[PDB]
PDB file of C-alpha atoms in Angstrom:
ATOM      1  CA  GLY A   2       5.749   1.097 -45.363  1.00  0.00           C
ATOM      2  CA  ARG A   3       8.605   0.722 -43.052  1.00  0.00           C
ATOM      3  CA  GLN A   4       9.561  -2.521 -41.257  1.00  0.00           C
ATOM      4  CA  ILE A   5       8.522  -3.437 -37.643  1.00  0.00           C
ATOM      5  CA  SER A   6       9.358  -6.370 -35.370  1.00  0.00           C
ATOM      6  CA  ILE A   7       6.483  -8.558 -33.938  1.00  0.00           C
ATOM      7  CA  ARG A   8       6.836 -11.184 -30.979  1.00  0.00           C
ATOM      8  CA  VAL A   9       5.117 -14.216 -31.978  1.00  0.00           C
ATOM      9  CA  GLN A  10       4.508 -17.074 -29.214  1.00  0.00           C
ATOM     10  CA  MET A  11       4.624 -20.654 -30.303  1.00  0.00           C
ATOM     11  CA  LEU A  12       2.557 -23.646 -28.986  1.00  0.00           C
ATOM     12  CA  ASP A  13       5.474 -24.965 -27.220  1.00  0.00           C
ATOM     13  CA  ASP A  14       5.570 -21.998 -24.813  1.00  0.00           C
ATOM     14  CA  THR A  15       8.579 -20.422 -26.687  1.00  0.00           C
ATOM     15  CA  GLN A  16       8.647 -16.927 -28.402  1.00  0.00           C
ATOM     16  CA  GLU A  17      10.349 -15.649 -31.429  1.00  0.00           C
ATOM     17  CA  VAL A  18      10.575 -12.077 -33.070  1.00  0.00           C
ATOM     18  CA  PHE A  19       9.990 -11.510 -36.799  1.00  0.00           C
ATOM     19  CA  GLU A  20      10.607  -8.414 -39.041  1.00  0.00           C
ATOM     20  CA  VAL A  21       7.854  -7.603 -41.609  1.00  0.00           C
ATOM     21  CA  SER A  22       6.974  -4.490 -43.488  1.00  0.00           C
ATOM     22  CA  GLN A  23       3.993  -2.549 -42.091  1.00  0.00           C
ATOM     23  CA  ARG A  24       2.120  -2.419 -45.342  1.00  0.00           C
ATOM     24  CA  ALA A  25       2.761  -5.996 -45.922  1.00  0.00           C
ATOM     25  CA  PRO A  26      -0.141  -8.561 -45.843  1.00  0.00           C
ATOM     26  CA  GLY A  27      -0.499 -10.530 -42.809  1.00  0.00           C
ATOM     27  CA  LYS A  28       0.128 -13.628 -45.057  1.00  0.00           C
ATOM     28  CA  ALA A  29       3.731 -12.280 -45.069  1.00  0.00           C
ATOM     29  CA  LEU A  30       4.293 -12.671 -41.255  1.00  0.00           C
ATOM     30  CA  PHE A  31       2.281 -15.995 -41.239  1.00  0.00           C
ATOM     31  CA  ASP A  32       4.768 -17.331 -43.927  1.00  0.00           C
ATOM     32  CA  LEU A  33       7.708 -16.451 -41.981  1.00  0.00           C
ATOM     33  CA  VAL A  34       6.259 -18.133 -38.826  1.00  0.00           C
ATOM     34  CA  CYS A  35       5.443 -21.206 -40.718  1.00  0.00           C
ATOM     35  CA  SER A  36       8.867 -21.397 -42.407  1.00  0.00           C
ATOM     36  CA  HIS A  37      10.494 -20.799 -39.053  1.00  0.00           C
ATOM     37  CA  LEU A  38       8.546 -23.851 -37.801  1.00  0.00           C
ATOM     38  CA  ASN A  39       9.171 -25.675 -41.262  1.00  0.00           C
ATOM     39  CA  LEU A  40       5.288 -25.940 -41.108  1.00  0.00           C
ATOM     40  CA  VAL A  41       4.370 -27.735 -44.447  1.00  0.00           C
ATOM     41  CA  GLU A  42       0.602 -27.769 -43.621  1.00  0.00           C
ATOM     42  CA  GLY A  43       0.144 -24.357 -42.248  1.00  0.00           C
ATOM     43  CA  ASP A  44      -3.416 -23.974 -43.816  1.00  0.00           C
ATOM     44  CA  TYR A  45      -4.924 -25.223 -40.500  1.00  0.00           C
ATOM     45  CA  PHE A  46      -3.258 -22.360 -38.573  1.00  0.00           C
ATOM     46  CA  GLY A  47      -3.536 -18.710 -37.717  1.00  0.00           C
ATOM     47  CA  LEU A  48      -2.298 -15.866 -35.722  1.00  0.00           C
ATOM     48  CA  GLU A  49      -4.521 -14.316 -33.100  1.00  0.00           C
ATOM     49  CA  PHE A  50      -4.125 -11.593 -30.541  1.00  0.00           C
ATOM     50  CA  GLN A  51      -6.272  -9.270 -28.478  1.00  0.00           C
ATOM     51  CA  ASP A  52      -7.091  -5.829 -30.088  1.00  0.00           C
ATOM     52  CA  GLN A  53      -7.760  -2.475 -28.102  1.00  0.00           C
ATOM     53  CA  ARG A  54     -11.185  -3.740 -27.299  1.00  0.00           C
ATOM     54  CA  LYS A  55      -9.594  -6.660 -25.427  1.00  0.00           C
ATOM     55  CA  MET A  56     -11.224  -9.179 -27.564  1.00  0.00           C
ATOM     56  CA  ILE A  57      -9.262 -11.796 -29.166  1.00  0.00           C
ATOM     57  CA  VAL A  58      -9.252 -11.438 -32.977  1.00  0.00           C
ATOM     58  CA  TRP A  59      -7.532 -13.242 -35.814  1.00  0.00           C
ATOM     59  CA  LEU A  60      -4.894 -11.596 -37.935  1.00  0.00           C
ATOM     60  CA  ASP A  61      -6.207 -10.847 -41.298  1.00  0.00           C
ATOM     61  CA  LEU A  62      -3.746 -12.587 -43.684  1.00  0.00           C
ATOM     62  CA  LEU A  63      -5.125 -10.405 -46.603  1.00  0.00           C
ATOM     63  CA  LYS A  64      -5.281  -7.024 -44.998  1.00  0.00           C
ATOM     64  CA  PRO A  65      -2.168  -4.891 -44.247  1.00  0.00           C
ATOM     65  CA  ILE A  66      -0.364  -5.542 -40.999  1.00  0.00           C
ATOM     66  CA  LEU A  67      -0.465  -1.804 -39.828  1.00  0.00           C
ATOM     67  CA  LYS A  68      -4.088  -1.587 -40.338  1.00  0.00           C
ATOM     68  CA  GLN A  69      -4.845  -4.179 -37.656  1.00  0.00           C
ATOM     69  CA  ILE A  70      -1.893  -3.538 -35.396  1.00  0.00           C
ATOM     70  CA  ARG A  71      -1.583  -0.750 -32.907  1.00  0.00           C
ATOM     71  CA  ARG A  72       1.617  -1.054 -30.796  1.00  0.00           C
ATOM     72  CA  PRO A  73       3.835  -3.749 -32.102  1.00  0.00           C
ATOM     73  CA  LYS A  74       6.071  -3.192 -29.068  1.00  0.00           C
ATOM     74  CA  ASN A  75       3.448  -4.334 -26.585  1.00  0.00           C
ATOM     75  CA  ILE A  76       1.253  -6.848 -28.503  1.00  0.00           C
ATOM     76  CA  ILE A  77       2.237 -10.504 -28.577  1.00  0.00           C
ATOM     77  CA  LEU A  78       0.653 -12.684 -31.325  1.00  0.00           C
ATOM     78  CA  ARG A  79       0.180 -16.456 -30.750  1.00  0.00           C
ATOM     79  CA  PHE A  80       0.369 -19.157 -33.456  1.00  0.00           C
ATOM     80  CA  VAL A  81      -2.709 -21.298 -32.788  1.00  0.00           C
ATOM     81  CA  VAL A  82      -4.882 -23.772 -34.848  1.00  0.00           C
ATOM     82  CA  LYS A  83      -7.601 -22.073 -36.932  1.00  0.00           C
ATOM     83  CA  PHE A  84      -9.498 -24.866 -38.490  1.00  0.00           C
ATOM     84  CA  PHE A  85      -9.800 -28.288 -36.814  1.00  0.00           C
ATOM     85  CA  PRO A  86     -10.396 -30.842 -39.666  1.00  0.00           C
ATOM     86  CA  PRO A  87     -12.554 -33.832 -39.173  1.00  0.00           C
ATOM     87  CA  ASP A  88     -10.031 -36.458 -40.345  1.00  0.00           C
ATOM     88  CA  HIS A  89      -6.870 -36.789 -38.244  1.00  0.00           C
ATOM     89  CA  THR A  90      -4.870 -39.727 -39.802  1.00  0.00           C
ATOM     90  CA  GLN A  91      -4.474 -37.817 -42.981  1.00  0.00           C
ATOM     91  CA  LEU A  92      -2.428 -35.083 -41.602  1.00  0.00           C
ATOM     92  CA  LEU A  93       0.772 -35.953 -43.396  1.00  0.00           C
ATOM     93  CA  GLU A  94       3.283 -34.110 -41.481  1.00  0.00           C
ATOM     94  CA  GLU A  95       4.168 -35.687 -38.091  1.00  0.00           C
ATOM     95  CA  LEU A  96       5.105 -32.201 -37.077  1.00  0.00           C
ATOM     96  CA  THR A  97       1.665 -30.826 -37.915  1.00  0.00           C
ATOM     97  CA  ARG A  98       0.069 -33.520 -35.813  1.00  0.00           C
ATOM     98  CA  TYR A  99       2.498 -32.340 -33.067  1.00  0.00           C
ATOM     99  CA  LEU A 100       1.413 -28.849 -33.123  1.00  0.00           C
ATOM    100  CA  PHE A 101      -2.227 -30.135 -32.970  1.00  0.00           C
ATOM    101  CA  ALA A 102      -1.320 -32.256 -29.881  1.00  0.00           C
ATOM    102  CA  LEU A 103       0.107 -29.153 -28.248  1.00  0.00           C
ATOM    103  CA  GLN A 104      -3.128 -27.280 -29.214  1.00  0.00           C
ATOM    104  CA  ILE A 105      -5.209 -29.880 -27.528  1.00  0.00           C
ATOM    105  CA  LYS A 106      -2.690 -29.871 -24.531  1.00  0.00           C
ATOM    106  CA  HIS A 107      -3.364 -25.901 -24.265  1.00  0.00           C
ATOM    107  CA  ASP A 108      -7.311 -26.135 -24.464  1.00  0.00           C
ATOM    108  CA  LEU A 109      -7.352 -29.057 -21.900  1.00  0.00           C
ATOM    109  CA  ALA A 110      -5.631 -26.771 -19.447  1.00  0.00           C
ATOM    110  CA  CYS A 111      -7.592 -23.569 -20.231  1.00  0.00           C
ATOM    111  CA  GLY A 112     -10.910 -25.280 -19.894  1.00  0.00           C
ATOM    112  CA  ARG A 113     -11.732 -24.665 -23.533  1.00  0.00           C
ATOM    113  CA  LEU A 114     -11.735 -28.583 -23.773  1.00  0.00           C
ATOM    114  CA  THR A 115     -13.809 -30.531 -21.248  1.00  0.00           C
ATOM    115  CA  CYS A 116     -15.092 -33.971 -21.473  1.00  0.00           C
ATOM    116  CA  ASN A 117     -15.802 -37.235 -19.583  1.00  0.00           C
ATOM    117  CA  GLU A 118     -13.459 -38.074 -16.595  1.00  0.00           C
ATOM    118  CA  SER A 119     -12.343 -41.201 -18.154  1.00  0.00           C
ATOM    119  CA  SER A 120     -11.883 -39.547 -21.437  1.00  0.00           C
ATOM    120  CA  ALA A 121      -9.979 -36.831 -19.734  1.00  0.00           C
ATOM    121  CA  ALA A 122      -7.641 -39.181 -17.960  1.00  0.00           C
ATOM    122  CA  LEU A 123      -6.847 -41.090 -21.123  1.00  0.00           C
ATOM    123  CA  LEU A 124      -6.104 -37.702 -22.941  1.00  0.00           C
ATOM    124  CA  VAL A 125      -3.692 -36.739 -20.176  1.00  0.00           C
ATOM    125  CA  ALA A 126      -2.322 -40.181 -19.957  1.00  0.00           C
ATOM    126  CA  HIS A 127      -1.152 -39.794 -23.497  1.00  0.00           C
ATOM    127  CA  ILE A 128       0.319 -36.336 -22.868  1.00  0.00           C
ATOM    128  CA  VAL A 129       2.233 -38.035 -20.066  1.00  0.00           C
ATOM    129  CA  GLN A 130       3.402 -40.867 -22.259  1.00  0.00           C
ATOM    130  CA  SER A 131       4.608 -38.280 -24.994  1.00  0.00           C
ATOM    131  CA  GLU A 132       6.630 -36.306 -22.523  1.00  0.00           C
ATOM    132  CA  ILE A 133       8.189 -38.828 -19.859  1.00  0.00           C
ATOM    133  CA  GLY A 134       7.919 -42.062 -21.858  1.00  0.00           C
ATOM    134  CA  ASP A 135       6.993 -45.444 -20.272  1.00  0.00           C
ATOM    135  CA  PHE A 136       5.053 -45.798 -16.846  1.00  0.00           C
ATOM    136  CA  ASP A 137       7.017 -45.631 -13.589  1.00  0.00           C
ATOM    137  CA  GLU A 138       5.105 -45.615 -10.342  1.00  0.00           C
ATOM    138  CA  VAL A 139       7.741 -43.311  -8.844  1.00  0.00           C
ATOM    139  CA  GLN A 140       8.366 -40.869 -11.849  1.00  0.00           C
ATOM    140  CA  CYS A 141       4.762 -40.640 -12.897  1.00  0.00           C
ATOM    141  CA  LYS A 142       2.899 -39.909  -9.717  1.00  0.00           C
ATOM    142  CA  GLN A 143       5.516 -37.294  -9.032  1.00  0.00           C
ATOM    143  CA  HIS A 144       5.232 -35.929 -12.626  1.00  0.00           C
ATOM    144  CA  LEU A 145       1.447 -35.409 -12.123  1.00  0.00           C
ATOM    145  CA  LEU A 146       1.995 -33.451  -9.021  1.00  0.00           C
ATOM    146  CA  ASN A 147       4.511 -31.117 -10.811  1.00  0.00           C
ATOM    147  CA  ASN A 148       2.430 -30.612 -14.001  1.00  0.00           C
ATOM    148  CA  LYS A 149      -1.296 -29.980 -14.049  1.00  0.00           C
ATOM    149  CA  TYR A 150      -2.799 -30.774 -17.407  1.00  0.00           C
ATOM    150  CA  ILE A 151      -6.451 -30.342 -16.397  1.00  0.00           C
ATOM    151  CA  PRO A 152      -8.200 -28.475 -13.737  1.00  0.00           C
ATOM    152  CA  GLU A 153      -9.280 -30.678 -10.929  1.00  0.00           C
ATOM    153  CA  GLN A 154      -6.596 -33.316 -11.810  1.00  0.00           C
ATOM    154  CA  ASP A 155      -5.916 -34.407  -8.280  1.00  0.00           C
ATOM    155  CA  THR A 156      -9.400 -36.049  -8.181  1.00  0.00           C
ATOM    156  CA  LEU A 157      -8.704 -37.700 -11.605  1.00  0.00           C
ATOM    157  CA  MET A 158      -5.091 -38.864 -10.696  1.00  0.00           C
ATOM    158  CA  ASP A 159      -5.714 -42.616 -10.214  1.00  0.00           C
ATOM    159  CA  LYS A 160      -7.389 -43.050 -13.704  1.00  0.00           C
ATOM    160  CA  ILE A 161      -4.385 -41.478 -15.304  1.00  0.00           C
ATOM    161  CA  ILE A 162      -2.023 -43.894 -13.606  1.00  0.00           C
ATOM    162  CA  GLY A 163      -4.108 -46.867 -15.050  1.00  0.00           C
ATOM    163  CA  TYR A 164      -4.264 -45.750 -18.546  1.00  0.00           C
ATOM    164  CA  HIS A 165      -0.490 -44.812 -18.379  1.00  0.00           C
ATOM    165  CA  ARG A 166       0.355 -48.495 -17.591  1.00  0.00           C
ATOM    166  CA  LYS A 167      -1.121 -49.305 -21.008  1.00  0.00           C
ATOM    167  CA  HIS A 168       0.669 -46.761 -23.068  1.00  0.00           C
ATOM    168  CA  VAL A 169       3.954 -48.509 -22.436  1.00  0.00           C
ATOM    169  CA  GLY A 170       6.393 -48.334 -25.455  1.00  0.00           C
ATOM    170  CA  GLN A 171       4.589 -45.734 -27.294  1.00  0.00           C
ATOM    171  CA  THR A 172       6.626 -43.121 -28.765  1.00  0.00           C
ATOM    172  CA  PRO A 173       5.840 -39.313 -28.405  1.00  0.00           C
ATOM    173  CA  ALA A 174       4.830 -39.236 -32.240  1.00  0.00           C
ATOM    174  CA  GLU A 175       2.631 -42.319 -31.401  1.00  0.00           C
ATOM    175  CA  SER A 176       1.093 -40.582 -28.411  1.00  0.00           C
ATOM    176  CA  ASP A 177       0.153 -37.281 -30.598  1.00  0.00           C
ATOM    177  CA  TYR A 178      -1.749 -39.505 -32.852  1.00  0.00           C
ATOM    178  CA  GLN A 179      -3.574 -41.259 -29.989  1.00  0.00           C
ATOM    179  CA  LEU A 180      -4.342 -37.912 -28.633  1.00  0.00           C
ATOM    180  CA  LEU A 181      -5.939 -36.670 -31.784  1.00  0.00           C
ATOM    181  CA  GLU A 182      -7.927 -39.872 -32.244  1.00  0.00           C
ATOM    182  CA  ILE A 183      -9.258 -39.741 -28.805  1.00  0.00           C
ATOM    183  CA  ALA A 184      -9.813 -35.951 -28.783  1.00  0.00           C
ATOM    184  CA  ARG A 185     -11.386 -35.551 -32.409  1.00  0.00           C
ATOM    185  CA  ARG A 186     -14.596 -37.443 -31.141  1.00  0.00           C
ATOM    186  CA  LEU A 187     -15.183 -34.996 -28.287  1.00  0.00           C
ATOM    187  CA  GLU A 188     -18.119 -32.752 -28.157  1.00  0.00           C
ATOM    188  CA  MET A 189     -15.965 -29.796 -27.394  1.00  0.00           C
ATOM    189  CA  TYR A 190     -13.248 -30.589 -29.891  1.00  0.00           C
ATOM    190  CA  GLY A 191     -11.901 -27.432 -31.734  1.00  0.00           C
ATOM    191  CA  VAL A 192     -14.903 -25.519 -30.280  1.00  0.00           C
ATOM    192  CA  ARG A 193     -14.368 -21.894 -29.468  1.00  0.00           C
ATOM    193  CA  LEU A 194     -17.506 -20.411 -27.984  1.00  0.00           C
ATOM    194  CA  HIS A 195     -19.294 -17.113 -28.765  1.00  0.00           C
ATOM    195  CA  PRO A 196     -22.072 -16.195 -26.175  1.00  0.00           C
ATOM    196  CA  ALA A 197     -25.433 -15.386 -27.488  1.00  0.00           C
ATOM    197  CA  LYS A 198     -29.173 -15.504 -26.289  1.00  0.00           C
ATOM    198  CA  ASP A 199     -32.149 -16.849 -28.183  1.00  0.00           C
ATOM    199  CA  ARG A 200     -35.435 -14.986 -28.502  1.00  0.00           C
ATOM    200  CA  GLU A 201     -36.394 -17.082 -25.473  1.00  0.00           C
ATOM    201  CA  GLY A 202     -33.674 -14.871 -23.609  1.00  0.00           C
ATOM    202  CA  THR A 203     -31.751 -18.264 -22.864  1.00  0.00           C
ATOM    203  CA  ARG A 204     -28.007 -17.852 -22.323  1.00  0.00           C
ATOM    204  CA  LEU A 205     -26.253 -20.098 -24.924  1.00  0.00           C
ATOM    205  CA  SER A 206     -23.350 -20.245 -27.154  1.00  0.00           C
ATOM    206  CA  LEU A 207     -22.817 -20.489 -30.844  1.00  0.00           C
ATOM    207  CA  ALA A 208     -19.751 -21.936 -32.641  1.00  0.00           C
ATOM    208  CA  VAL A 209     -18.532 -23.238 -36.130  1.00  0.00           C
ATOM    209  CA  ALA A 210     -17.089 -26.369 -37.348  1.00  0.00           C
ATOM    210  CA  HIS A 211     -16.213 -28.376 -40.329  1.00  0.00           C
ATOM    211  CA  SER A 212     -19.891 -29.605 -40.500  1.00  0.00           C
ATOM    212  CA  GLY A 213     -21.493 -26.304 -39.978  1.00  0.00           C
ATOM    213  CA  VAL A 214     -22.716 -24.045 -37.134  1.00  0.00           C
ATOM    214  CA  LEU A 215     -23.027 -25.267 -33.646  1.00  0.00           C
ATOM    215  CA  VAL A 216     -25.317 -24.151 -30.559  1.00  0.00           C
ATOM    216  CA  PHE A 217     -24.226 -24.988 -26.940  1.00  0.00           C
ATOM    217  CA  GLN A 218     -25.826 -24.674 -23.636  1.00  0.00           C
ATOM    218  CA  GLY A 219     -22.913 -24.387 -21.191  1.00  0.00           C
ATOM    219  CA  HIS A 220     -20.679 -26.945 -22.802  1.00  0.00           C
ATOM    220  CA  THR A 221     -23.413 -29.372 -24.168  1.00  0.00           C
ATOM    221  CA  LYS A 222     -24.152 -29.221 -27.990  1.00  0.00           C
ATOM    222  CA  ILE A 223     -27.654 -28.395 -28.625  1.00  0.00           C
ATOM    223  CA  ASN A 224     -28.264 -28.132 -32.387  1.00  0.00           C
ATOM    224  CA  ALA A 225     -25.969 -28.603 -35.504  1.00  0.00           C
ATOM    225  CA  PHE A 226     -26.844 -26.829 -38.844  1.00  0.00           C
ATOM    226  CA  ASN A 227     -24.854 -28.498 -41.553  1.00  0.00           C
ATOM    227  CA  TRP A 228     -23.652 -26.357 -44.546  1.00  0.00           C
ATOM    228  CA  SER A 229     -26.153 -28.398 -46.664  1.00  0.00           C
ATOM    229  CA  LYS A 230     -28.874 -27.097 -44.549  1.00  0.00           C
ATOM    230  CA  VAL A 231     -27.780 -23.416 -44.167  1.00  0.00           C
ATOM    231  CA  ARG A 232     -28.938 -21.074 -46.933  1.00  0.00           C
ATOM    232  CA  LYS A 233     -27.393 -17.838 -45.871  1.00  0.00           C
ATOM    233  CA  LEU A 234     -25.469 -16.307 -42.851  1.00  0.00           C
ATOM    234  CA  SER A 235     -26.278 -12.755 -41.949  1.00  0.00           C
ATOM    235  CA  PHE A 236     -26.015 -10.201 -38.851  1.00  0.00           C
ATOM    236  CA  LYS A 237     -27.568  -7.067 -38.153  1.00  0.00           C
ATOM    237  CA  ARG A 238     -25.943  -4.925 -35.366  1.00  0.00           C
ATOM    238  CA  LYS A 239     -26.034  -7.183 -32.326  1.00  0.00           C
ATOM    239  CA  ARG A 240     -28.334 -10.060 -33.713  1.00  0.00           C
ATOM    240  CA  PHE A 241     -27.183 -13.032 -35.827  1.00  0.00           C
ATOM    241  CA  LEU A 242     -29.223 -14.474 -38.559  1.00  0.00           C
ATOM    242  CA  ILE A 243     -29.139 -18.210 -39.740  1.00  0.00           C
ATOM    243  CA  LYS A 244     -31.457 -18.973 -42.868  1.00  0.00           C
ATOM    244  CA  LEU A 245     -32.210 -22.613 -43.309  1.00  0.00           C
ATOM    245  CA  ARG A 246     -33.490 -24.600 -46.352  1.00  0.00           C
ATOM    246  CA  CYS A 253     -36.867 -23.188 -45.657  1.00  0.00           C
ATOM    247  CA  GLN A 254     -37.728 -23.494 -41.958  1.00  0.00           C
ATOM    248  CA  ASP A 255     -37.278 -19.950 -40.545  1.00  0.00           C
ATOM    249  CA  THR A 256     -34.671 -17.402 -39.795  1.00  0.00           C
ATOM    250  CA  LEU A 257     -33.402 -18.099 -36.224  1.00  0.00           C
ATOM    251  CA  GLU A 258     -32.302 -14.779 -34.352  1.00  0.00           C
ATOM    252  CA  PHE A 259     -29.651 -14.679 -31.785  1.00  0.00           C
ATOM    253  CA  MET A 260     -28.696 -11.632 -29.578  1.00  0.00           C
ATOM    254  CA  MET A 261     -24.770 -11.356 -29.268  1.00  0.00           C
ATOM    255  CA  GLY A 262     -22.629  -9.100 -27.082  1.00  0.00           C
ATOM    256  CA  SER A 263     -21.430  -6.222 -29.607  1.00  0.00           C
ATOM    257  CA  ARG A 264     -21.631  -5.309 -33.134  1.00  0.00           C
ATOM    258  CA  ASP A 265     -18.019  -6.660 -33.339  1.00  0.00           C
ATOM    259  CA  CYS A 266     -19.058  -9.995 -31.883  1.00  0.00           C
ATOM    260  CA  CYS A 267     -21.419 -10.533 -34.727  1.00  0.00           C
ATOM    261  CA  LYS A 268     -18.590  -9.446 -37.245  1.00  0.00           C
ATOM    262  CA  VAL A 269     -16.118 -11.776 -35.613  1.00  0.00           C
ATOM    263  CA  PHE A 270     -18.314 -14.819 -35.667  1.00  0.00           C
ATOM    264  CA  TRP A 271     -19.582 -13.909 -39.190  1.00  0.00           C
ATOM    265  CA  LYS A 272     -16.185 -14.059 -40.597  1.00  0.00           C
ATOM    266  CA  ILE A 273     -15.073 -17.367 -38.967  1.00  0.00           C
ATOM    267  CA  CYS A 274     -18.473 -18.884 -40.151  1.00  0.00           C
ATOM    268  CA  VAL A 275     -17.574 -17.883 -43.734  1.00  0.00           C
ATOM    269  CA  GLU A 276     -13.924 -18.682 -43.442  1.00  0.00           C
ATOM    270  CA  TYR A 277     -14.737 -22.124 -42.024  1.00  0.00           C
ATOM    271  CA  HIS A 278     -17.410 -22.906 -44.945  1.00  0.00           C
ATOM    272  CA  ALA A 279     -14.932 -21.626 -47.468  1.00  0.00           C
ATOM    273  CA  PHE A 280     -12.109 -23.867 -46.093  1.00  0.00           C
ATOM    274  CA  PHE A 281     -14.215 -27.030 -46.411  1.00  0.00           C
ATOM    275  CA  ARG A 282     -16.449 -26.188 -49.375  1.00  0.00           C
TER     276      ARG A 282
END
């Protein structure tokens, strides 16, 4: 039950080091990171890391820390959004919105968030507005060459300039709000994909949202199974099972027995968070 030190990385590319008991629940560490950030609406967030199997796993806030930690000297947890709500104007804390805008900033660069060209330009133009202020032909075009917010940004540079000339006078807090309003309508918003194959042997991807379970081909949404139309979620070894209310039980082959367990957990945790 001794104390250990854990290095947590924040959404602003900074890192801190906290000290928690080994036998303490994950919630204890999660509380320290929230109070360090003065995060009042921390319910939307979580701590994720890569395990020994090199797959990114959430930190169980109910289980002990030493159960899910291996070498706290080498592992870096990262504070990330865990649940993306549908309504965005209700996020009371301006800081809470700010961490979300940072989150979208990250997903935009990783490729976890893709969208239409004009949408992507507008989303960047708000990020630029929040960071360097009002438009300036000299400063802006320079700033887009020193900072790459989306892959293949150079081809999209002219459109970002146009949108930036419109955001004049908007504060960074006003820009984060515009980020969320424009990002929350995106097909890939808050979407973290789990690869799978149907009985047809078709390479697809499954995900979960506030509305329910999602099915993607590449990055295009295929089906949506709302919680109202989802009877039971199950998994056997390397096959996922979705029972509907009753059509049939759609089977999905996934990568490993752990992949099913991971997706199964976040499906229950998503429904339990919105119902």
